[PDB]
Amino acid sequence: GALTESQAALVKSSWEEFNANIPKHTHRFFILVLEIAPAAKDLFSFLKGTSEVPQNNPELQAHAGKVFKLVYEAAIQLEVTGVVVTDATLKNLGSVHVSKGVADAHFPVVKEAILKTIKEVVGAKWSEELNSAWTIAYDELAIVIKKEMDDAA
Ligand code: HEM
Ligand SMILES: O=Nc1ccccc1
């Protein structure tokens, strides 16, 4: 696919639709995560000691929303420029993931949870052309964070 002017216009459009409801899309996102792998729960300070995923936890919201923002920006940056660029932030991201005890085999958990989440968010507009475009953008961004973890470990 590469990222045509038309495929990029499709991810933008679809991220806008996600941000449009953070407390919902974020709590959805944590549940799809815990469906795909329940053990993951002891990772999160705000989920530990709990029984269910808190639904108005500020810490939870603020953190999951940052995740999706970062995938979208990665997709424009691929249509424009042709690539995803590794900055200070991505590098600190990788430190924190290591302290919390996160590994690589964790990443398809969070990708499926995200493709599924965007499938749910765009509904009938969904096209092959679009799945292809978020897949490209997540894969290309994961490639970069993993890189930074490995580096913090
Ligand atoms: C491209 C894919 C990913 C992106 C963009 C991303 C982004 C983030 C960000 C931005 C934060 C910190 C939020 C804050 O400090 O304000 C964070 C924290 C965290 N992330 Fe990820 N993430 C990704 C994949 C993963 C995976 C695969 C896991 C494994 C389950 C994970 C587990 C965690 C944990 C446990 C924390 C600490 C939360 C705490 O104890 O309060 N992340 N991530
Ligand atoms: O997937 N990484 C996450 C970031 C912040 C909070 C929870 C998860």
mmCIF file of C-alpha atoms and ligand atoms in Angstrom:
data_model
loop_
_atom_site.group_PDB
_atom_site.id
_atom_site.type_symbol
_atom_site.label_atom_id
_atom_site.label_comp_id
_atom_site.label_asym_id
_atom_site.label_seq_id
_atom_site.Cartn_x
_atom_site.Cartn_y
_atom_site.Cartn_z
ATOM 1 C CA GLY A 1 0.000 0.000 0.000
ATOM 2 C CA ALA A 2 2.837 2.342 1.008
ATOM 3 C CA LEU A 3 0.744 5.147 2.207
ATOM 4 C CA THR A 4 -0.985 7.079 -0.649
ATOM 5 C CA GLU A 5 -2.441 10.334 -0.268
ATOM 6 C CA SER A 6 -5.613 8.540 -0.210
ATOM 7 C CA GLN A 7 -4.658 5.919 2.486
ATOM 8 C CA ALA A 8 -3.373 8.764 4.852
ATOM 9 C CA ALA A 9 -6.435 10.596 4.451
ATOM 10 C CA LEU A 10 -8.140 7.437 5.649
ATOM 11 C CA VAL A 11 -6.059 7.083 9.060
ATOM 12 C CA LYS A 12 -6.577 10.779 9.856
ATOM 13 C CA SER A 13 -10.047 10.597 9.424
ATOM 14 C CA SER A 14 -10.294 7.446 11.590
ATOM 15 C CA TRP A 15 -8.119 8.901 14.520
ATOM 16 C CA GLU A 16 -10.259 11.797 14.646
ATOM 17 C CA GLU A 17 -13.085 9.549 15.158
ATOM 18 C CA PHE A 18 -11.188 7.744 18.191
ATOM 19 C CA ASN A 19 -10.291 10.914 20.215
ATOM 20 C CA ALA A 20 -13.666 11.897 19.934
ATOM 21 C CA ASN A 21 -14.368 9.601 22.998
ATOM 22 C CA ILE A 22 -11.403 8.916 25.179
ATOM 23 C CA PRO A 23 -12.965 7.474 28.423
ATOM 24 C CA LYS A 24 -14.858 5.014 26.301
ATOM 25 C CA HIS A 25 -12.357 4.028 23.707
ATOM 26 C CA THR A 26 -9.594 3.754 26.443
ATOM 27 C CA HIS A 27 -11.479 1.568 28.880
ATOM 28 C CA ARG A 28 -12.443 -0.608 25.675
ATOM 29 C CA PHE A 29 -9.005 -0.771 24.730
ATOM 30 C CA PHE A 30 -7.969 -2.196 28.450
ATOM 31 C CA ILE A 31 -10.700 -4.751 28.384
ATOM 32 C CA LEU A 32 -9.583 -5.999 24.867
ATOM 33 C CA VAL A 33 -6.193 -6.143 26.207
ATOM 34 C CA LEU A 34 -7.261 -8.329 29.370
ATOM 35 C CA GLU A 35 -9.331 -10.532 26.876
ATOM 36 C CA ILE A 36 -6.457 -11.219 24.763
ATOM 37 C CA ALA A 37 -4.219 -11.769 27.998
ATOM 38 C CA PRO A 38 -5.513 -11.603 31.718
ATOM 39 C CA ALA A 39 -2.163 -11.842 33.381
ATOM 40 C CA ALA A 40 -1.403 -8.394 32.052
ATOM 41 C CA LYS A 41 -3.340 -6.949 34.856
ATOM 42 C CA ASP A 42 -0.650 -7.125 37.674
ATOM 43 C CA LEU A 43 1.337 -4.711 35.390
ATOM 44 C CA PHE A 44 -0.697 -1.740 35.841
ATOM 45 C CA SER A 45 -0.569 0.183 39.416
ATOM 46 C CA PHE A 46 -3.881 1.404 38.787
ATOM 47 C CA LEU A 47 -5.333 -2.071 38.026
ATOM 48 C CA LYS A 48 -3.363 -3.932 40.884
ATOM 49 C CA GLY A 49 -5.385 -4.451 44.044
ATOM 50 C CA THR A 50 -8.428 -3.831 41.927
ATOM 51 C CA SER A 51 -10.718 -6.650 40.650
ATOM 52 C CA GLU A 52 -12.273 -4.884 37.520
ATOM 53 C CA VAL A 53 -10.784 -2.243 35.087
ATOM 54 C CA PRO A 54 -11.594 1.093 36.748
ATOM 55 C CA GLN A 55 -13.629 3.205 34.250
ATOM 56 C CA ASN A 56 -12.868 6.771 35.498
ATOM 57 C CA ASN A 57 -9.447 6.482 36.537
ATOM 58 C CA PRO A 58 -7.536 9.538 35.361
ATOM 59 C CA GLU A 59 -4.417 7.712 35.274
ATOM 60 C CA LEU A 60 -5.780 5.010 33.014
ATOM 61 C CA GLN A 61 -7.331 7.575 30.497
ATOM 62 C CA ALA A 62 -4.476 9.809 30.215
ATOM 63 C CA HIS A 63 -2.211 6.988 29.632
ATOM 64 C CA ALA A 64 -4.297 4.894 26.935
ATOM 65 C CA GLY A 65 -5.072 8.088 24.867
ATOM 66 C CA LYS A 66 -1.478 8.893 24.478
ATOM 67 C CA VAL A 67 -1.036 5.422 22.978
ATOM 68 C CA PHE A 68 -3.474 6.027 19.907
ATOM 69 C CA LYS A 69 -2.160 9.511 19.272
ATOM 70 C CA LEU A 70 1.112 8.330 18.794
ATOM 71 C CA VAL A 71 0.008 5.665 16.094
ATOM 72 C CA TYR A 72 -1.867 8.329 14.006
ATOM 73 C CA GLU A 73 0.982 10.685 13.988
ATOM 74 C CA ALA A 74 3.142 7.901 12.813
ATOM 75 C CA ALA A 75 0.784 7.302 9.661
ATOM 76 C CA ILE A 76 0.996 10.950 8.446
ATOM 77 C CA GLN A 77 4.514 11.056 8.972
ATOM 78 C CA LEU A 78 4.747 7.931 6.642
ATOM 79 C CA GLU A 79 2.640 9.516 3.787
ATOM 80 C CA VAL A 80 4.514 12.746 3.814
ATOM 81 C CA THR A 81 7.869 11.866 4.477
ATOM 82 C CA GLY A 82 7.941 8.210 3.616
ATOM 83 C CA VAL A 83 9.161 7.146 7.336
ATOM 84 C CA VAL A 84 8.396 7.149 11.381
ATOM 85 C CA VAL A 85 10.947 9.488 13.222
ATOM 86 C CA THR A 86 12.346 8.348 16.835
ATOM 87 C CA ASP A 87 12.360 11.359 19.242
ATOM 88 C CA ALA A 88 13.094 11.981 23.230
ATOM 89 C CA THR A 89 9.807 10.845 24.036
ATOM 90 C CA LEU A 90 9.916 7.567 22.316
ATOM 91 C CA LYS A 91 13.105 6.960 24.136
ATOM 92 C CA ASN A 92 11.681 7.502 27.642
ATOM 93 C CA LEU A 93 8.806 5.346 26.663
ATOM 94 C CA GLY A 94 10.975 2.578 26.192
ATOM 95 C CA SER A 95 12.468 3.052 29.919
ATOM 96 C CA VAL A 96 9.357 3.094 31.685
ATOM 97 C CA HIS A 97 8.182 -0.119 29.857
ATOM 98 C CA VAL A 98 11.106 -2.000 30.988
ATOM 99 C CA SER A 99 10.512 -0.826 34.876
ATOM 100 C CA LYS A 100 7.084 -1.936 34.744
ATOM 101 C CA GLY A 101 8.135 -5.386 33.608
ATOM 102 C CA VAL A 102 6.669 -5.201 29.776
ATOM 103 C CA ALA A 103 8.158 -7.485 27.041
ATOM 104 C CA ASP A 104 7.948 -7.732 22.942
ATOM 105 C CA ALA A 105 5.407 -10.566 23.048
ATOM 106 C CA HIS A 106 3.268 -8.098 24.656
ATOM 107 C CA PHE A 107 2.999 -5.907 21.261
ATOM 108 C CA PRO A 108 0.585 -8.040 19.068
ATOM 109 C CA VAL A 109 -1.618 -7.983 22.243
ATOM 110 C CA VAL A 110 -1.794 -4.241 22.143
ATOM 111 C CA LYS A 111 -2.003 -4.237 18.011
ATOM 112 C CA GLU A 112 -4.885 -6.513 17.848
ATOM 113 C CA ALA A 113 -6.464 -4.644 20.689
ATOM 114 C CA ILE A 114 -5.887 -1.353 18.657
ATOM 115 C CA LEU A 115 -7.180 -2.836 15.048
ATOM 116 C CA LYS A 116 -10.040 -4.220 16.754
ATOM 117 C CA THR A 117 -10.617 -0.966 18.685
ATOM 118 C CA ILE A 118 -10.374 1.080 15.182
ATOM 119 C CA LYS A 119 -12.660 -1.467 13.491
ATOM 120 C CA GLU A 120 -15.051 -0.777 16.217
ATOM 121 C CA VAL A 121 -14.567 2.944 16.071
ATOM 122 C CA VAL A 122 -15.077 3.364 11.967
ATOM 123 C CA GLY A 123 -17.613 0.775 11.593
ATOM 124 C CA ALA A 124 -19.050 0.518 7.840
ATOM 125 C CA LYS A 125 -16.460 2.786 6.459
ATOM 126 C CA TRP A 126 -14.137 0.055 7.142
ATOM 127 C CA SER A 127 -12.184 -1.013 3.968
ATOM 128 C CA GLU A 128 -9.435 -3.092 3.164
ATOM 129 C CA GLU A 129 -7.591 -0.026 2.103
ATOM 130 C CA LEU A 130 -8.010 1.405 5.818
ATOM 131 C CA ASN A 131 -7.082 -1.762 7.853
ATOM 132 C CA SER A 132 -4.198 -1.824 5.616
ATOM 133 C CA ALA A 133 -3.301 1.752 6.445
ATOM 134 C CA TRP A 134 -3.474 1.375 10.564
ATOM 135 C CA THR A 135 -1.659 -1.844 10.262
ATOM 136 C CA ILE A 136 1.096 -0.217 8.440
ATOM 137 C CA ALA A 137 1.230 2.784 10.876
ATOM 138 C CA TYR A 138 1.223 0.504 14.204
ATOM 139 C CA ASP A 139 3.680 -1.887 12.864
ATOM 140 C CA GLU A 140 5.916 0.915 11.802
ATOM 141 C CA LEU A 141 5.603 2.702 15.358
ATOM 142 C CA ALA A 142 6.110 -0.573 17.358
ATOM 143 C CA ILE A 143 9.150 -1.133 15.444
ATOM 144 C CA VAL A 144 10.512 2.072 16.905
ATOM 145 C CA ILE A 145 9.451 1.639 20.756
ATOM 146 C CA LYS A 146 10.678 -1.859 20.902
ATOM 147 C CA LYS A 147 13.741 -0.552 19.639
ATOM 148 C CA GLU A 148 13.975 1.893 22.656
ATOM 149 C CA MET A 149 13.128 -0.847 25.321
ATOM 150 C CA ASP A 150 15.702 -3.053 24.213
ATOM 151 C CA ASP A 151 17.931 -0.157 24.530
ATOM 152 C CA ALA A 152 16.723 0.628 28.229
ATOM 153 C CA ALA A 153 16.992 -2.948 29.493
HETATM 154 C C1 HEM B 1 3.263 1.398 19.641
HETATM 155 C C2 HEM B 1 2.766 0.724 20.768
HETATM 156 C C3 HEM B 1 2.739 1.420 22.276
HETATM 157 C C4 HEM B 1 2.640 2.751 22.582
HETATM 158 C C5 HEM B 1 2.590 3.968 21.592
HETATM 159 C C6 HEM B 1 2.598 2.901 24.098
HETATM 160 C C7 HEM B 1 2.565 4.123 24.821
HETATM 161 C C8 HEM B 1 2.698 4.255 26.326
HETATM 162 C C9 HEM B 1 2.838 5.540 27.057
HETATM 163 C C10 HEM B 1 2.850 6.887 26.219
HETATM 164 C C11 HEM B 1 2.967 5.285 28.509
HETATM 165 C C12 HEM B 1 3.134 6.284 29.769
HETATM 166 C C13 HEM B 1 1.955 7.086 30.069
HETATM 167 C C14 HEM B 1 2.444 8.193 31.087
HETATM 168 O O1 HEM B 1 3.554 8.145 31.598
HETATM 169 O O2 HEM B 1 1.905 9.288 31.113
HETATM 170 C C15 HEM B 1 3.020 3.832 28.693
HETATM 171 C C16 HEM B 1 3.045 3.207 30.014
HETATM 172 C C17 HEM B 1 2.857 1.861 30.290
HETATM 173 N N1 HEM B 1 2.666 0.927 29.222
HETATM 174 FE FE1 HEM B 1 2.704 1.200 27.058
HETATM 175 N N2 HEM B 1 2.638 1.678 24.723
HETATM 176 C C18 HEM B 1 2.735 0.736 23.690
HETATM 177 C C19 HEM B 1 2.769 -0.675 23.948
HETATM 178 C C20 HEM B 1 2.702 -1.335 25.257
HETATM 179 C C21 HEM B 1 2.643 -2.773 25.483
HETATM 180 C C22 HEM B 1 2.743 -3.873 24.339
HETATM 181 C C23 HEM B 1 2.458 -3.006 26.906
HETATM 182 C C24 HEM B 1 2.287 -4.413 27.616
HETATM 183 C C25 HEM B 1 1.210 -4.837 28.156
HETATM 184 C C26 HEM B 1 2.466 -1.692 27.607
HETATM 185 C C27 HEM B 1 2.377 -1.473 29.091
HETATM 186 C C28 HEM B 1 2.537 -0.289 29.861
HETATM 187 C C29 HEM B 1 2.668 -0.134 31.461
HETATM 188 C C30 HEM B 1 2.536 -1.300 32.562
HETATM 189 C C31 HEM B 1 2.833 1.196 31.701
HETATM 190 C C32 HEM B 1 2.936 1.902 33.168
HETATM 191 C C33 HEM B 1 1.652 2.358 33.613
HETATM 192 C C34 HEM B 1 1.725 2.573 35.266
HETATM 193 O O3 HEM B 1 2.122 1.671 36.126
HETATM 194 O O4 HEM B 1 1.138 3.520 35.785
HETATM 195 N N3 HEM B 1 2.642 -0.697 26.569
HETATM 196 N N4 HEM B 1 2.842 3.223 27.344
HETATM 197 O O1 LIG B 2 0.078 0.239 26.037
HETATM 198 N N1 LIG B 2 0.705 1.099 26.793
HETATM 199 C C1 LIG B 2 -0.016 1.799 27.795
HETATM 200 C C2 LIG B 2 0.259 3.124 28.137
HETATM 201 C C3 LIG B 2 -0.312 3.778 29.232
HETATM 202 C C4 LIG B 2 -1.177 3.129 29.989
HETATM 203 C C5 LIG B 2 -1.493 1.820 29.651
HETATM 204 C C6 LIG B 2 -0.923 1.138 28.542
#
